[PDB]
Amino acid sequence: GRGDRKTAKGKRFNHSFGNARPKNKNKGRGPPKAPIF
Amino acid sequence: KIRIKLRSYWVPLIEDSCKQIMDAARTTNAKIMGPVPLPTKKRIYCVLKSPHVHKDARFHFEIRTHQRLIDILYPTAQTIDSLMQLDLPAGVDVEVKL
Amino acid sequence: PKKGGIGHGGLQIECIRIGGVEIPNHKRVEYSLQYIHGIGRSRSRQILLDLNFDNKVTKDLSEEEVIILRKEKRFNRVAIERLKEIRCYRGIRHKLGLPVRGQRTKNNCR
Amino acid sequence: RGTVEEKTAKSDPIYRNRLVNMLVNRILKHGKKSLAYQILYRAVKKIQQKTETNPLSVLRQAIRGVTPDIAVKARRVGGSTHQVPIEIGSTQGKALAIRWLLGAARKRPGRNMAFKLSSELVDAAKGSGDAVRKKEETHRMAEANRAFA
Amino acid sequence: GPLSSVKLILQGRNLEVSDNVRSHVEDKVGKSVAKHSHLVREVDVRLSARGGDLSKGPKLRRCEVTLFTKRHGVIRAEEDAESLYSSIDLVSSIIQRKLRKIKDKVSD
Amino acid sequence: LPGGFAAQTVIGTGRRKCAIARVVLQEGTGKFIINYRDAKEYLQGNPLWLQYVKTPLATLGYETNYDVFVKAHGGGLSGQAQAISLGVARALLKVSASHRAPLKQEGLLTRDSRIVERKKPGLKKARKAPQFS
Amino acid sequence: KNPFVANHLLRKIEKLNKKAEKEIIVTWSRASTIIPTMIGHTIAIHNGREHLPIYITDRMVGHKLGEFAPTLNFRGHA
Amino acid sequence: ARKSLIQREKKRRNLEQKYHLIRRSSKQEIRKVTSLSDKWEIHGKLQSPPRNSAPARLHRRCFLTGRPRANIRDFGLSGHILREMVHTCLLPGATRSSW
Amino acid sequence: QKINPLGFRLGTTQSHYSLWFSQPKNYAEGLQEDQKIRDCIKNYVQKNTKTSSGVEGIARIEIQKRIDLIQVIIHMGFPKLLIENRPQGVEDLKINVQKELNCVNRKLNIAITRIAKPYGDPNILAEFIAGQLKSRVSFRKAMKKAIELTEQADTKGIQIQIAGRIDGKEIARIEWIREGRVPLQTIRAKIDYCAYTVRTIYGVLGIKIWIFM
RNA sequence: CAACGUGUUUGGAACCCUGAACAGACUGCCGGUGAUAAGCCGGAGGAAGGUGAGGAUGACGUCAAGUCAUCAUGCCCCUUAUGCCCUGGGCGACACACGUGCUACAAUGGCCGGGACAAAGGGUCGCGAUCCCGCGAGGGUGAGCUAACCCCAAAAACCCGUCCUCAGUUCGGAUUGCAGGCUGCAACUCGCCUGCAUGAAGCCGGAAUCGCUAGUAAUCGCCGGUCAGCCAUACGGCGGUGAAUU
């Protein structure tokens, strides 16, 4: 939710930066999901 | 070619001081850009009111920095001496830039 | 299916199902959808056996189910050995990221 | 305090109806008005898929079977509490009608809120489910005590 | 309040509390509000002392007892006497009248 | 979308709380533009917002008759749509002022007092208070 | 990046680990690291009131010293 | 506060300007590790002997009274003193706005 | 409890004193400079007229900074009492005020002005009731004496509050007397007040004088 | 606002905004009610109609309320000490009890991707754009800005697709371990933050109890202060969506 600091909404609540809430979206990202078909 | 900045905490002093600087600058020389009021740098402070424990009911006062940009076009020698003739305003901070 | 030692997940979506395994790495779950290029959204049903071989190898490549239980309890018998404040607060079951314990420590007060 | 300034009530966004706009305000939970809008119009596009009449007809005919004419107001005289029934107004019965309809629609599980509001809505349209039974159990209690006034 | 009663909360200000003090509190307050049949939620008994040989002013022992009851409001009684024991007995009497005011006002 | 105007012939202004909107109302067809997007894609589907845009023109029934490409910033989308709406009303006043009587009789030329109240110290949200027991 | 050592403790290393082995020798400045040239020495860690003799094994390496000495005398019937 | 603690901040400030630029310009050269990474551990020994010249230890009290807390830093004064230098027409521009 | 009038009326009809317009770190340092100037003037005249006879009554110390030059106006009611008669009073003021401002050696003009009517200025009148009340004179004689002493010198309305520990007591009181209109709420009304603390022998007294002009 | 292709290069002051003065709303007009009056109900006009909205504002006084740890001070008391300097602890303990907040308990939901629109602030010992290294917190380089210029700064809820579509779950995130980074002489007791690991309790809450009459409630973010860094889920603000009932 918002304390879930391993998420994006959690880091947005915590006023911090990590994988899920990136600065400069070109640079820095976790592994990308591949649902494919 | 010159930009002078007028900052104060008091509106009749920038009004009257910029009034007379625009007056002298117009009556001594040629066409000069008017005073553009660029907005109020205004900022607030919350003071805990009672000395001891009363966390509610505080006193937040706000300081207001008024400022006007005013631009004189052409540097003429008796016009530079006209502006530097007037060391008139009581506190109003005046700055010079190109 | 069944994965490495004994542990295995249900018959659900594949990324979630690997999450159901005891102790894998969720970023390396996401990498196990990328190096193997496994289709994550498809369930644990409809998986070719070569994909199961690749899964069992890549899950052998990182520490898992029994192994991390073994090494963490090795740091717990380490956390019997050398008389530390972490160890002293595990004789008495407190919290060691240090909350203020004057109130409300009931992950361990139970 | 004296009174409330009269009322301002607008009609439905896409059908121009003062009832369905009332219903889209009542399904609203904390400001998400586009989502409550979405739930209601997916319920209407669901109700065109179930039967083949006007959704105003199945909606209004549904809420006629939820609206009570009388209810219990547990009043007091001399310290003595009578459960005396007092005849409720019309638009009050509208608000109570979509009130019980909506809260009872937040109980029937299985699927998204379009199916939930659709299913309890047609149960109001057939005298089944829970909202019209709630009408009965709040209606057979004021009927049970007419020996007061 | 030994058992089954309202929850007791003591406050000791300027006063080292003993066995006889809080024993006299729960026995006089608790055993005089033992014929109660009241589910009062919380009793805050705030038992401060002052003056005499401690500081400037006459010898005072001042108790306030507050009951956060369900039964028609909250009540508090402050009395100031020459001893702790006279304070707590006197507030015990006051709270007897206030609770009989509550129970007796529930009538008809 | 191109095809500019670059002038201020028949203008209209409007402003809900932080959302300002200036409009120009050209006698056209109806493919109208918030800042450089379509009305549907900028007002983000069809909530009530697009209907508040369609309200003053459908009051006079002038849906085909005009084309009102809009320049607007500030605020959020609903108030920006409302300021578009009152921009349309003050624009229609400045073409054919004999439309005063239909427009003013409805709530189209007015302005609500929608303004966020400030936090009041000792409260939490200008009315929300912390509870006590 | 760089472990942190109190410099008088470094002079304790440069005094006993250069001349000859020794005993209980006292330090203040609890915040120092382990520094594996200290293994086998007994360090007296200040605990608020006194100095405790703590023998330093090679298993205790990679921490700081006052994790080993508790400061609160909570015997405890709380 | 007490009469001692104001001069605690005073003599701590004298130790700040005593070798502020010297010691912290030395740290400007220590953290520059392009040349070497492993060494200079002892040179933290030379970082050590300034003790009260650590600017982490330097507070800013209210200069007129001395409360270490609630010092609005842009004025240098405390909380409660700042009222009676607004309410006595003393601070310029303090127009007590209640917008 | 009640807001004080010189704080309340700052947007209109009451002007600030320390009239210099600056930037934040320079604001804190300019406030340093202001406070040391008011310290040197107050302590100066208190010393060099404590040896002298009467009370002085310095009401306002306005400090202004046009250029790198500081106009300091001193509004006392009895300005002839100060000087050493050629001008040497204000000269020695200018010496000791130059002692604590010479960061940038900028010139300062210490002037001095007259209060129009010194009884009508609440800092001066509060100093009078402070002085007589610090002598062994009752609240009533001295306080009524301040009232008729004021109304002979043309004041519209007045309120006098004297705080606790009057002549011989161990229980504090408040004693206030009012004449005429003193509307504290009317923002146009131009009330000037003072709040002087008398440091007596058997305690501390508090005098608070409102004057509606 | 407009053009040139991604400036200070051209015009215009026409919209917007900034900010000084003015005007406006005062039961002013009309109708009707009321001893003719105060008013009361409605209507027109008007951006706004009956204190337009919010604030500041708080009489004599009460609780001999709180504050001698903001400050000042009567009296009393200590004075090779009840004063002062320095290092370590401590204010952060923990069987429990009381209170205020945040997170939640899920499909109006959660995740991912791609789209969309703010306000108000802060910043020359700083804010730090750009490029490179690193999964990242971060490191280096440092253009621009003393602030309507630049930066903090990505606004988020919201819209469109993919999945789960009823589970203690792709809900929830506690607790613990390993590995790091930053600040600062120093991060163990006792800082924040990143990367991995675990996945506790918790299926809307007894008795009781609280806030709110509209841009309010609820809900989603952003900023500031103090500040080397932070315990801030607090406080002081600012917008976004945005009700029901009387």
Curated annotation (Swiss-Prot), chain B:
User: Under what name is this protein listed?
Assistant: 30S ribosomal protein S10 beta, chloroplastic
Q: What range of the parent protein does this fragment cover? A: 98 to 195 of 195
Gene name, Swiss-Prot/TrEMBL: RPS10
Q: Which organism is it from?
A: Spinacia oleracea (Spinach)
Q: Which domain of life is it from?
A: Eukaryota
Swiss-Prot record, chain D:
Q: Which GO terms describe its cellular component?
A: chloroplast; ribosome; small ribosomal subunit
Gene Ontology MF annotations:
mRNA binding; rRNA binding; structural constituent of ribosome
Pfam families xref list: Ribosomal_S7 (PF00177)
Q: How does it assemble?
A: Component of the chloroplast small ribosomal subunit (SSU). Mature 70S chloroplast ribosomes of higher plants consist of a small (30S) and a large (50S) subunit. The 30S small subunit contains 1 molecule of ribosomal RNA (16S rRNA) and 24 different proteins. The 50S large subunit contains 3 rRNA molecules (23S, 5S and 4.5S rRNA) and 33 different proteins.
The name this protein goes by in its record: Small ribosomal subunit protein uS7cz/uS7cy
Main site of residence?
plastid
Q: Its encoding gene is what? A: rps7-A
Function comment:
Component of the chloroplast ribosome (chloro-ribosome), a dedicated translation machinery responsible for the synthesis of chloroplast genome-encoded proteins, including proteins of the transcription and translation machinery and components of the photosynthetic apparatus.
Q: Which NCBIfam families match?
A: rpsG_bact
Q: Which InterPro entries match?
A: Ribosomal_uS7, Ribosomal_uS7_bac/org-type, Ribosomal_uS7_CS, Ribosomal_uS7_dom, Ribosomal_uS7_dom_sf
Q: Which UniProt keywords apply?
A: Chloroplast, Plastid, Ribonucleoprotein, Ribosomal protein, RNA-binding, rRNA-binding
Family matches, as HAMAP family: Ribosomal_uS7_B
CDD domains assigned to the protein according to its UniProt record, in alphabetical order: uS7_Chloroplast
Superkingdom of the organism of origin = Eukaryota
Localisation: Plastid, Chloroplast
Keyword DNA-binding tagged: no
Curated annotation (Swiss-Prot), chain E:
Which cellular compartments is it found in?
A: Plastid, Chloroplast stroma
Q: What does this protein do?
A: Ribosome-binding factor involved in light- and temperature-dependent control of protein synthesis. Interacts with 16S sRNA nucleotides at the A-site and P-site, where it protects the decoding center and inhibits translation by preventing tRNA binding. Stabilizes 70S ribosomes against dissociation. May be recycled by the combined action of ribosome-recycling factor (RRF) and EF-G.
Subunit annotation: Binds to the mRNA channel of the chloroplast small ribosomal subunit and interacts with 16S sRNA nucleotides at the A-site and P-site.
Similarity field:
Belongs to the HPF/YfiA ribosome-associated protein family. Long plastid HPF subfamily.
Q: What is this protein called?
A: Ribosome-binding factor PSRP1, chloroplastic
Instruction: Tell me the organism's taxonomic lineage.
Output: Eukaryota, Viridiplantae, Streptophyta, Embryophyta, Tracheophyta
Curated annotation (Swiss-Prot), chain I:
Q: Name one GO cellular component term.
A: cytosolic small ribosomal subunit
Q: Which residues form the KH type-2 domain?
A: 45-116
Molecular-function annotations in GO: rRNA binding; structural constituent of ribosome
InterPro entries documented for this protein? KH_dom-like_a/b, KH_dom_type_2, KH_sf_prok-type, Ribosomal_S3_C_sf, Ribosomal_uS3_bac-typ, Ribosomal_uS3_C, Ribosomal_uS3_CS
Name the UniProt key words of this record, in alphabetical order: Chloroplast, Plastid, Ribonucleoprotein, Ribosomal protein, RNA-binding, rRNA-binding
- GO biological process, alphabetically ordered: translation
Pfam families, per the entry? Ribosomal_S3_C
Q: Where in the cell does this protein reside? A: Plastid, Chloroplast
Q: Which HAMAP family match?
A: Ribosomal_uS3_B
Q: What does this protein do?
A: Component of the chloroplast ribosome (chloro-ribosome), a dedicated translation machinery responsible for the synthesis of chloroplast genome-encoded proteins, including proteins of the transcription and translation machinery and components of the photosynthetic apparatus.
Q: Which family does this protein fall into?
A: Belongs to the universal ribosomal protein uS3 family.
Quaternary structure and partners: Component of the chloroplast small ribosomal subunit (SSU). Mature 70S chloroplast ribosomes of higher plants consist of a small (30S) and a large (50S) subunit. The 30S small subunit contains 1 molecule of ribosomal RNA (16S rRNA) and 24 different proteins. The 50S large subunit contains 3 rRNA molecules (23S, 5S and 4.5S rRNA) and 33 different proteins.
NCBIfam families according to UniProt = rpsC_bact
The name under which this protein is listed is Small ribosomal subunit protein uS3c
